[PDB]
Amino acid sequence: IVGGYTCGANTVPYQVSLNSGYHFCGGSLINSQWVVSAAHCYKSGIQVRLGEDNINVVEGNEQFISASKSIVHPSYNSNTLNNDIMLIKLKSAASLNSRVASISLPTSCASAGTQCLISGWGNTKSSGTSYPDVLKCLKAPILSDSSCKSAYPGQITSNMFCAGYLEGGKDSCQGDSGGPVVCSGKLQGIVSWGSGCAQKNKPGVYTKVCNYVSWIKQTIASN
Ligand SMILES: COc1cccc(CN)c1
Ligand SMILES: [Ca+2]
């Protein structure tokens, strides 16, 4: 997260870190045994880490649970990043509490202008590299489809939305991938892609979660 703020420990209780020896992606807890992330975060040997603030220190509220299975969206295209969504099932159910909690799926798609919360442990610099160890947060509006399409000609599908600031300076970044965009207490987006971070006229692009609710529910119900 570039240009954000320190969230505060366990203030984003649905935020998870995906760890394969090291943090590589964010995700969102959507019930006691399932996480939603980006398809481009797919790999083997994933451990889900819940209740994290400082990802380098065991602070006392963590639950570490290995993934039993990952399910990448059947229509995911890694070139265009269309359908950039994947489900991860936990080997055992997380113990839910005030600091480890699921986030509700949307019943409706959020409109342009809606304020949302984007969070992650990604890079905090727009040039060069610095990784925070504590969770960072950014409040950002959803942008209009037209402004999003104008920013990225030929690349925005009906399964994507832009959020952030056309002026730059505030954005998601490398390592935030797969993490939440939450608006009015619902998971509306997943950190997917962009052109660099916090650059003028290159806002972050997010997977449009409201398009996948049926797939998520049906997949969970049979797996
Ligand atoms: C360039 O790497 C990125 C990864 C995730 C999200 C974003 C959005 N600026 C960028
Ligand atoms: Ca920790």
Swiss-Prot record:
<keyword id="KW-0645">Protease</keyword>
<comment type="similarity">
    <text>Belongs to the peptidase S1 family.</text>
</comment>
<dbReference type="GO" id="GO:0005615">
    <property type="term" value="C:extracellular space"/>
</dbReference>
<feature type="active site" description="Charge relay system">
    <location>
        <position position="84"/>
    </location>
</feature>
<dbReference type="GO" id="GO:0004175">
    <property type="term" value="F:endopeptidase activity"/>
</dbReference>
<feature type="disulfide bond">
    <location>
        <begin position="109"/>
        <end position="210"/>
    </location>
</feature>
<feature type="active site" description="Charge relay system">
    <location>
        <position position="177"/>
    </location>
</feature>
<feature type="binding site">
    <location>
        <position position="52"/>
    </location>
    <ligand>
        <name>Ca(2+)</name>
    </ligand>
</feature>
<feature type="disulfide bond">
    <location>
        <begin position="7"/>
        <end position="137"/>
    </location>
</feature>
<keyword id="KW-0378">Hydrolase</keyword>
<dbReference type="InterPro" id="IPR001254">
    <property type="entry name" value="Trypsin_dom"/>
</dbReference>
<dbReference type="InterPro" id="IPR009003">
    <property type="entry name" value="Peptidase_S1_PA"/>
</dbReference>
<feature type="disulfide bond">
    <location>
        <begin position="116"/>
        <end position="183"/>
    </location>
</feature>
<feature type="binding site">
    <location>
        <position position="62"/>
    </location>
    <ligand>
        <name>Ca(2+)</name>
    </ligand>
</feature>
<dbReference type="InterPro" id="IPR033116">
    <property type="entry name" value="TRYPSIN_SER"/>
</dbReference>
<feature type="binding site">
    <location>
        <position position="177"/>
    </location>
    <ligand>
        <name>substrate</name>
    </ligand>
</feature>
<feature type="binding site">
    <location>
        <position position="54"/>
    </location>
    <ligand>
        <name>Ca(2+)</name>
    </ligand>
</feature>
<keyword id="KW-0106">Calcium</keyword>
<comment type="subunit">
    <text>Interacts with SERPINA1.</text>
</comment>
<dbReference type="InterPro" id="IPR001314">
    <property type="entry name" value="Peptidase_S1A"/>
</dbReference>
<dbReference type="GO" id="GO:0046872">
    <property type="term" value="F:metal ion binding"/>
</dbReference>
<feature type="disulfide bond">
    <location>
        <begin position="148"/>
        <end position="162"/>
    </location>
</feature>
<dbReference type="GO" id="GO:0006508">
    <property type="term" value="P:proteolysis"/>
</dbReference>
<protein>
    <recommendedName>
        <fullName>Serine protease 1</fullName>
        <ecNumber>3.4.21.4</ecNumber>
    </recommendedName>
</protein>
<keyword id="KW-0732">Signal</keyword>
<feature type="disulfide bond">
    <location>
        <begin position="25"/>
        <end position="41"/>
    </location>
</feature>
<feature type="binding site">
    <location>
        <begin position="171"/>
        <end position="172"/>
    </location>
    <ligand>
        <name>substrate</name>
    </ligand>
</feature>
<dbReference type="GO" id="GO:0097180">
    <property type="term" value="C:serine protease inhibitor complex"/>
</dbReference>
<dbReference type="InterPro" id="IPR018114">
    <property type="entry name" value="TRYPSIN_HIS"/>
</dbReference>
<feature type="binding site">
    <location>
        <begin position="174"/>
        <end position="175"/>
    </location>
    <ligand>
        <name>substrate</name>
    </ligand>
</feature>
<dbReference type="GO" id="GO:0004252">
    <property type="term" value="F:serine-type endopeptidase activity"/>
</dbReference>
<dbReference type="Pfam" id="PF00089">
    <property type="entry name" value="Trypsin"/>
</dbReference>
<dbReference type="GO" id="GO:0007586">
    <property type="term" value="P:digestion"/>
</dbReference>
<feature type="active site" description="Charge relay system">
    <location>
        <position position="40"/>
    </location>
</feature>
<dbReference type="InterPro" id="IPR050127">
    <property type="entry name" value="Serine_Proteases_S1"/>
</dbReference>
<feature type="disulfide bond">
    <location>
        <begin position="173"/>
        <end position="197"/>
    </location>
</feature>
<keyword id="KW-0222">Digestion</keyword>
<keyword id="KW-0479">Metal-binding</keyword>
<feature type="domain" description="Peptidase S1">
    <location>
        <begin position="1"/>
        <end position="221"/>
    </location>
</feature>
<keyword id="KW-1015">Disulfide bond</keyword>
<dbReference type="InterPro" id="IPR043504">
    <property type="entry name" value="Peptidase_S1_PA_chymotrypsin"/>
</dbReference>
<feature type="binding site">
    <location>
        <position position="57"/>
    </location>
    <ligand>
        <name>Ca(2+)</name>
    </ligand>
</feature>
